[PDB]
Design an enzyme around this catalytic site. Structure first.
Site, PDB file in Angstrom:
ATOM      1  N   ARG A   1      -7.943   1.479  -5.501  1.00  0.00           N
ATOM      2  CA  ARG A   1      -7.021   0.546  -4.863  1.00  0.00           C
ATOM      3  C   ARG A   1      -7.358  -0.920  -5.160  1.00  0.00           C
ATOM      4  O   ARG A   1      -8.503  -1.358  -5.006  1.00  0.00           O
ATOM      5  CB  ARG A   1      -6.976   0.809  -3.348  1.00  0.00           C
TER       6      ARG A   1
ATOM      7  N   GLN B   1       3.314  -6.754   0.278  1.00  0.00           N
ATOM      8  CA  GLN B   1       2.964  -7.501   1.485  1.00  0.00           C
ATOM      9  C   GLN B   1       3.907  -8.668   1.697  1.00  0.00           C
ATOM     10  O   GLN B   1       4.331  -9.318   0.744  1.00  0.00           O
ATOM     11  CB  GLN B   1       1.507  -7.972   1.455  1.00  0.00           C
TER      12      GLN B   1
ATOM     13  N   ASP C   1       6.394  -4.411 -11.511  1.00  0.00           N
ATOM     14  CA  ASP C   1       5.589  -4.166 -10.328  1.00  0.00           C
ATOM     15  C   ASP C   1       5.422  -5.462  -9.542  1.00  0.00           C
ATOM     16  O   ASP C   1       5.123  -6.517 -10.121  1.00  0.00           O
ATOM     17  CB  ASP C   1       4.212  -3.599 -10.720  1.00  0.00           C
TER      18      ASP C   1
ATOM     19  N   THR D   1       0.443   2.704  -8.413  1.00  0.00           N
ATOM     20  CA  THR D   1       0.019   4.033  -8.832  1.00  0.00           C
ATOM     21  C   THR D   1       1.098   4.683  -9.697  1.00  0.00           C
ATOM     22  O   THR D   1       0.788   5.437 -10.631  1.00  0.00           O
ATOM     23  CB  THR D   1      -0.255   4.922  -7.637  1.00  0.00           C
TER      24      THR D   1
ATOM     25  N   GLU E   1       0.783  -1.235   0.000  1.00  0.00           N
ATOM     26  CA  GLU E   1       0.000   0.000   0.000  1.00  0.00           C
ATOM     27  C   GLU E   1       0.823   1.299   0.000  1.00  0.00           C
ATOM     28  O   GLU E   1       0.297   2.365   0.352  1.00  0.00           O
ATOM     29  CB  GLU E   1      -1.035   0.024   1.135  1.00  0.00           C
TER      30      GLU E   1
HETATM   31  N1  LIG Z   1      -3.293  10.754  -1.249  1.00  0.00           N
HETATM   32  C1  LIG Z   1      -2.405   9.895  -1.822  1.00  0.00           C
HETATM   33  N2  LIG Z   1      -2.749   8.628  -2.031  1.00  0.00           N
HETATM   34  C2  LIG Z   1      -1.764   7.920  -2.599  1.00  0.00           C
HETATM   35  C3  LIG Z   1      -0.515   8.346  -2.958  1.00  0.00           C
HETATM   36  N3  LIG Z   1       0.214   7.306  -3.516  1.00  0.00           N
HETATM   37  C4  LIG Z   1      -0.600   6.284  -3.494  1.00  0.00           C
HETATM   38  N4  LIG Z   1      -1.821   6.588  -2.956  1.00  0.00           N
HETATM   39  C5  LIG Z   1      -2.960   5.688  -2.800  1.00  0.00           C
HETATM   40  O1  LIG Z   1      -2.600   4.670  -1.890  1.00  0.00           O
HETATM   41  C6  LIG Z   1      -3.272   3.436  -2.234  1.00  0.00           C
HETATM   42  C7  LIG Z   1      -2.298   2.283  -2.338  1.00  0.00           C
HETATM   43  O2  LIG Z   1      -1.472   2.404  -3.510  1.00  0.00           O
HETATM   44  P1  LIG Z   1      -1.018   1.109  -4.322  1.00  0.00           P
HETATM   45  O3  LIG Z   1      -0.262   1.563  -5.515  1.00  0.00           O
HETATM   46  O4  LIG Z   1      -2.216   0.243  -4.478  1.00  0.00           O
HETATM   47  O5  LIG Z   1      -0.057   0.416  -3.409  1.00  0.00           O
HETATM   48  P2  LIG Z   1       0.946  -0.651  -3.728  1.00  0.00           P
HETATM   49  O6  LIG Z   1       2.243  -0.290  -3.110  1.00  0.00           O
HETATM   50  O7  LIG Z   1       0.883  -0.931  -5.173  1.00  0.00           O
HETATM   51  O8  LIG Z   1       0.367  -1.834  -2.995  1.00  0.00           O
HETATM   52  P3  LIG Z   1       0.605  -3.333  -3.088  1.00  0.00           P
HETATM   53  O9  LIG Z   1       0.006  -3.833  -4.359  1.00  0.00           O
HETATM   54  O10 LIG Z   1       2.045  -3.584  -2.818  1.00  0.00           O
HETATM   55  S1  LIG Z   1      -0.371  -4.320  -1.807  1.00  0.00           S
HETATM   56  C8  LIG Z   1      -4.049   3.735  -3.509  1.00  0.00           C
HETATM   57  O11 LIG Z   1      -5.402   4.047  -3.165  1.00  0.00           O
HETATM   58  C9  LIG Z   1      -3.336   4.958  -4.053  1.00  0.00           C
HETATM   59  O12 LIG Z   1      -4.151   5.777  -4.843  1.00  0.00           O
HETATM   60  C10 LIG Z   1      -0.160   9.692  -2.732  1.00  0.00           C
HETATM   61  O13 LIG Z   1       0.897  10.252  -2.984  1.00  0.00           O
HETATM   62  N5  LIG Z   1      -1.187  10.406  -2.151  1.00  0.00           N
HETATM   63 MG   LIG Z   2       0.157  -3.238  -5.968  1.00  0.00          MG
END
Ligand SMILES: Nc1nc2c(ncn2[C@@H]2O[C@H](COP(=O)(O)OP(=O)(O)OP(O)(O)=S)[C@@H](O)[C@H]2O)c(=O)[nH]1
Ligand SMILES: [Mg+2]
Ligand SMILES: Nc1ncnc2c1ncn2[C@@H]1O[C@H](CO[P@@](=O)(S)OP(=O)(O)OP(=O)(O)O)[C@@H](O)[C@H]1O
Ligand SMILES: C=C[C@@]1(C)CC(=O)[C@]2(O)[C@@]3(C)[C@@H](O)CCC(C)(C)[C@@H]3[C@H](O)[C@H](OC(C)=O)[C@@]2(C)O1
Ligand SMILES: [Cl-]
Ligand SMILES: [Mg+2]
Ligand SMILES: [Mn+2]
Lengths: 330, 189, 190
Positions: A143, A169, A165, A17, A12
């Site tokens: 998400r 987790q 990517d 993103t 997360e």
């Molecule tokens: N406000 C805000 N939200 C953000 C920012 N970067 C990411 N998010 C939000 O956080 C959430 C998690 O991002 P995500 O890209 O799903 O995580 P991840 O690292 O890919 O997660 P995972 O697949 O390892 S479990 C999403 O809803 C995304 O839009 C940011 O800079 N600002």
């Molecule tokens: Mg992811």
């Protein structure tokens, strides 16, 4: 000339993103995504409402009328194929405007809540329409969990890039090893605003502390002794919102902050508050302190203040990254 | 470099044959460790001889498990036929040994075709080997095979061009791996 | 070439059960090559252990799949070589733990040790590969294929020898082994 880039960081932290931003900037399926945005909307509302009675002290509704809507929400919580009737959006919207429900949202660091919560709940009327067409900011906020490795190809000024990517987790990390070989650079993403939250996997270990540990474990890895890492201190927007609010204090989680003061070489954005500057830089130094301790000369670390859901910022930051890859002949 | 140099390369369109002895653990309980090895040497010497003739490259011996491949290291379009002809000679050889020795040696034969990775691993005591799902399957064809008969998959049959007459092997009902992965087996006449 | 018989050799089959599960074939991991790269690392760190002076009598015979097979006593009051084979097992576990901390995994080792008379030499016609044969080797393998994770399963006779050397054991009970029948096995205490 091709560059193999790998995205790492806890769950997360905003990795998926970033890849999405590459698509928007450098590289139809929207109808398939609407179903996903609606799930986030449902997931967000049922989580806030369910935690109201389990907190200490518990949060009370501002309108006894809403207790009926609460019962509705819980009744349809674990339903498989949810068709989303028009009543659902009404009930959702009503609770979201209740003060009790809203105060519970304030203390959301105490339980597990998705980041796109407040965004989707603020535009329920827009999503209820059957002629709804997801904006680009909607697609970024959405998400969804990542399980496996996904390859994304693209070009910037006739230059090739291969982005990987992976799931952040714990259980999804055992797959990372399959990318360690022949990688141009690593991009470690961290949730800068998650200093007052705990990881989903156990509900105890501090989110940022997990980020620091994982980074230290990546920096001193035996198969990445000559691999440079570009650090993305992501979620800068939420960090500021928290710092300025003043409710959740940083020195209450990381005591070392009380001894930290802003450096002389600091570059604050125009208008930026001293307090924001001090906090955002404190987190930077915590990650650098680890990278500075070893690996001398072999590989380098390049910090960056990021906000993934901001295409403007990302365009700028990835251009700074294309520079690093070229200056150092990576 | 941070990763030890790896000595492996990929190869598509190859055939893999496996051969194992029935009740070997049981057999080793009767005759002396000295005598048993002689029956094994008698058997595996002939095996290795027939391999070179039929253009099959022997890999290694895992006790009573013998395995070789065709199509390595240099590519060949005759590969499928080679492994089939290999088993033909093997099954016959096993009879001779069992006849001239007296020992109850019986073997199952398994064949499958596809892609494989090959080379060596580690630093000490190298030994050429092969790895891939297609190899894992070939190994399972031997388990689900039949004593003194050649068990093959559908993928192997496609490289045979209809020269040998086959019949339903029902391998699905003998080995769980074959069933769970939806495999169609056949037997040679 | 030439073969030879022995009296007291200690065989060991150290397996890694969870690897087969970890092995995949995709377009990103290059048809399962990346997975085989990690296995290469593991075998490497196990092989370089043979240089440690305390393991001067250990003889790596080969690796079957992801199962490391080795033995002691081939270079020959005197039972210490059996105890050494156990010491080599603890070492492999220390090496597999290090691989876990760096690959973000949780791989565990299953061991099977037995001892007795075997035959040593080469066979066939193709290559000069040294290998060992005998019932001792057959039983040793069963001690691994029917073992428990993080445990060293040993036969009864081996259990006694290990006990005289200062070790402690625990009865696993009576298990019906393929082709052997009812064998009473044991586990080593750490
Ligand atoms: N406000 C805000 N939200 C953000 C920012 N970067 C990411 N998010 C939000 O956080 C959430 C998690 O991002 P995500 O890209 O799903 O995580 P991840 O690292 O890919 O997660 P995972 O697949 O390892 S479990 C999403 O809803 C995304 O839009 C940011 O800079 N600002
Ligand atoms: Mg992811
Ligand atoms: N030098 C060696 N290297 C490796 N494995 C060896 C070995 N010597 C013996 N073995 C082992 O000896 C055993 C023989 O294989 P089964 O267990 S297949 O015995 P079966 O009674 O014939 O069973 P069936 O196939 O159902 O009929 C394996 O554990 C080999 O690893
Ligand atoms: C290393 C990965 C993988 C999947 C690759 C492979 O094809 C194998 O090496 C074979 C089938 C294959 O190499 C042929 C020999 C033998 C000994 C039969 C192997 C083992 O069964 C391996 O698994 C074990 C259990 O060691 C297995 C299945 O492991
Ligand atoms: Cl994070
Ligand atoms: Mg066998
Ligand atoms: Mn057998």
């Amino acid at each position: 000339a091709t560059h193999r880039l790998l995205l790492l960081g806890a769950g997360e932290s905003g990795k998926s993103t970033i890849v999405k931003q590459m698509r928007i900037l450098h590289v139809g399926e929207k109808a398939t995504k609407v179903q996903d945005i609606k799930n986030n909307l449902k997931e967000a509302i049922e989580t806030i409402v369910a935690a109201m009675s389990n907190l200490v002290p518990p949060v009370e509704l501002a309108n006894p009328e809403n207790q009926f809507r609460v019962d509705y929400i819980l009744s349809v919580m674990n339903v498989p194929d949810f068709d989303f009737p028009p009543e659902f959006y009404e009930h959702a919207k009503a609770l979201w405007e209740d003060e009790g429900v809203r105060a519970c949202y304030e203390r959301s660091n105490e339980y597990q809540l998705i980041d796109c919560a407040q965004y989707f709940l603020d535009k329920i009327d827009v999503i209820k329409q059957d002629d709804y067409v997801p904006s680009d900011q909607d697609l970024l906020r959405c998400r969804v969990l990542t399980s496996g490795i996904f390859e994304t190809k693209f070009q910037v000024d006739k230059v090739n890039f291969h982005m990987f990517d992976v799931g952040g987790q714990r259980d999804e990390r055992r797959k990372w090893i399959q990318c360690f070989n022949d990688v141009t650079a690593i991009i470690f993403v961290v949730a800068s605003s998650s200093y007052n939250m705990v990881i989903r996997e156990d509900n105890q270990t501090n989110r940022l502390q997990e980020a620091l540990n994982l980074f230290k474990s990546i920096w001193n890895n035996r198969w990445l002794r000559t691999i440079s890492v570009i650090l993305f201190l992501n979620k800068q927007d939420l960090l500021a919102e928290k710092v300025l609010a003043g409710k959740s204090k940083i020195e209450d989680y990381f005591p070392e902050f009380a001894r930290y003061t802003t450096p002389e070489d600091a570059t604050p954005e125009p208008g930026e508050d001293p307090r924001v500057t001090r906090a955002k830089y404190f987190i930077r130094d915590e990650f650098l302190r680890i990278s500075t301790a070893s690996g001398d000369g072999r590989h380098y670390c390049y910090p960056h203040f990021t906000c993934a859901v901001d295409t403007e910022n990302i365009r700028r930051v990835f251009n700074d990254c294309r520079d690093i890859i070229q200056r150092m002949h990576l | 470099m941070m990763f030890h140099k790896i000595y492996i390369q990929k190869h598509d369109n190859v055939s893999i044959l496996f051969a194992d002895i029935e009740g070997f653990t049981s057999l080793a309980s009767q005759c002396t460790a000295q005598e048993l090895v002689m029956t094994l040497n008698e058997l595996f010497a002939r095996f290795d001889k027939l391999a070179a003739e039929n253009h099959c490259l022997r890999i290694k011996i895992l006790g009573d498990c013998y395995y070789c491949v065709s199509g390595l290291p240099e590519a060949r379009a005759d590969h499928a036929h080679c492994c089939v002809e290999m088993g033909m000679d093997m099954i016959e050889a096993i009879s001779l040994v069992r006849e001239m020795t007296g020992v109850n040696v019986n073997m199952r034969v398994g064949i499958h075709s596809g892609r494989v990775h090959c080379g060596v691993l580690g630093l000490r005591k190298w030994q050429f080997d092969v790895w891939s799902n297609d190899v894992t399957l070939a190994n399972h064809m031997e388990a689900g095979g039949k004593a003194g008969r050649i068990h093959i998959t559908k993928a192997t049959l496609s490289y045979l061009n209809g020269d040998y007459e086959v019949e339903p092997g029902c391998g699905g009902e003998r080995n769980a791996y074959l069933k769970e992965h939806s495999i169609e087996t056949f037997l040679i006449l | 070439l030439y073969h030879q018989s022995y009296d007291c050799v200690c065989v060991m089959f150290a397996s890694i059960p969870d690897f087969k599960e970890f092995y995949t074939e995709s377009d990103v991991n290059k048809e399962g090559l990346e997975c085989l790269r990690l296995l290469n690392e593991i075998i490497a760190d196990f092989d370089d252990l043979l240089s440690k002076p305390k393991f001067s009598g250990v003889e790596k015979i080969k690796t079957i799949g992801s199962t490391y097979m080795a033995a002691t006593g081939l270079s020959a009051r005197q039972y210490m070589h059996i105890g050494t084979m156990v010491e080599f097992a603890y070492a492999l576990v220390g090496k597999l733990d290090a691989i876990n901390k760096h690959s973000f995994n949780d791989f565990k080792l299953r061991v099977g040790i037995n001892h007795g008379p075997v035959i040593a030499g080469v066979i066939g016609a193709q290559k000069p590969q040294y290998d060992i044969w005998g019932n001792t080797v057959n039983v040793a393998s069963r001690m691994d294929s029917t073992g428990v994770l993080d445990k060293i399963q040993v036969t009864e006779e081996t259990s006694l020898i290990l006990q005289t050397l200062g070790y402690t054991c625990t009865c696993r009970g009576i298990i019906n082994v393929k082709g052997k029948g009812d064998l009473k096995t044991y586990f080593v205490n750490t």
